[PDB]
Design a protein around this ligand. Sequence first.
Ligand SMILES: Nc1nc2c(ncn2[C@@H]2O[C@H](COP(=O)(O)OP(=O)(O)OP(=O)(O)O)[C@@H](O)[C@H]2O)c(=O)[nH]1
Ligand SMILES: Nc1nc2c(ncn2[C@@H]2O[C@H](COP(=O)(O)OP(=O)(O)OP(=O)(O)O)[C@@H](O)[C@H]2O)c(=O)[nH]1
Ligand SMILES: [Mg+2]
Ligand SMILES: [Mg+2]
Lengths: 170, 174, 25, 33
Amino acid sequence: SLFKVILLGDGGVGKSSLMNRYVTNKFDTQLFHTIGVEFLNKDLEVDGHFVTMQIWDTAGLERFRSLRTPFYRGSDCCLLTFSVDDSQSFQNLSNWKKEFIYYADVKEPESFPFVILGNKIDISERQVSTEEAQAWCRDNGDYPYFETSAKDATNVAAAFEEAVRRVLAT
Amino acid sequence: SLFKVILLGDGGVGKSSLMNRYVTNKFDTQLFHTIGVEFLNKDLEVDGHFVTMQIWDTAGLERFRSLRTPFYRGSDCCLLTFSVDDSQSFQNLSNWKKEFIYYADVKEPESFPFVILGNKIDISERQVSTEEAQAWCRDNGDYPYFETSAKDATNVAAAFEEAVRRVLATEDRS
Amino acid sequence: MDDLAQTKAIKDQLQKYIRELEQAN
Amino acid sequence: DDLAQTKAIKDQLQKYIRELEQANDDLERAKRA
Ligand SMILES: Nc1nc2c(ncn2[C@@H]2O[C@H](COP(=O)(O)OP(=O)(O)OP(=O)(O)O)[C@@H](O)[C@H]2O)c(=O)[nH]1
Ligand SMILES: Nc1nc2c(ncn2[C@@H]2O[C@H](COP(=O)(O)OP(=O)(O)OP(=O)(O)O)[C@@H](O)[C@H]2O)c(=O)[nH]1
Ligand SMILES: [Mg+2]
Ligand SMILES: [Mg+2]
């Protein structure tokens, strides 16, 4: 059926910018911060399988927790997103993983598919290195890691495609 | 074809209850104040004409003005609602007409269809009389006036049906 | 109507959020 | 158009919360003064 994949992470890491880049191929400098949730349909072929997908976009800001968390239920894959110019967004990945598992109410949460995205790699002055992000992914569930730029349209489809592969695997 | 009709009026006069009575034939004592706008669809036949009526319910409370006003535009007919047990809600009619006229931007206000509803006639202790309500309607557009009860269902169906008639009457005015 | 339904569900959740902001204020 | 119209309502709701959020930023910055 319909693959549900959902984007979590700190405010301003680029969640809405990744989803909009992937679905409508647009990018904007002054996007409004998300109030609650959004979803866009997206249909694709992955490894020759036709897939129907619904990308869910959630607010990063803490005060909107109560708006996002009812919509975690029934998600097939979770994309944990940080900005590579924001070491705090990277340190909070564990907090986002736990927030998902607490509200998602998934059977066997220890084998649930997470994909990790480090966004904004167009910015030269990085606060998070590739190696430390890979160390964390390897050491916290062994998740696939993708460095992305919504702005430059770098590696954006590859992250969502891999999420589909992980659901198909499950 | 589709007919958009909109309910305006003070908080708690029974706009939501009027719509839920008409569409779902239910009534609730403990009904929550409306946050923003709502709509429901109802299919009916008025005078041979098979019609879908989209009923727009709005929040009456002052703080929700900016929430409701962007949905005034496109209404074929406006239902100004007051409560017969609330004199203030009746005094406010002029304000609600002026607000609808501004935000839906109705030029030709002299011919746009309004229907006035005095709700809660099931309450004994009235605070607005039938004649003074009928007076106001004659003098401010000569509108149809309906004394209704969402609680009892009195004249509810008739009120909504009449709104379709006023729309059919001016749509046949070409 | 799962898309319409889903959007209704989001709208409802936003209205809950306003209902609780307003009651404190 | 019902899906389209519900989206418009949600948009207004989100707009309202943004405005409300601004109102509280004004009172909180009033308390700090
Ligand atoms: N250089 C660069 N800037 C980006 C990129 N993606 C987003 N931005 C900028 O960073 C800001 C944050 O983007 P958003 O997608 O709104 O961030 P968010 O995660 O949706 O934030 P919340 O909605 O609060 O969760 C935007 O105003 C963009 O201009 C990127 O890939 N590269
Ligand atoms: N006796 C009686 N009570 C009613 C009637 N209509 C509504 N009520 C009661 O009065 C209250 C107000 O009804 P609502 O439909 O919420 O009024 P409203 O105009 O929608 O108020 P807002 O949503 O704030 O604009 C409800 O809780 C009902 O129980 C009626 O016809 N008769
Ligand atoms: Mg966003
Ligand atoms: Mg109401």
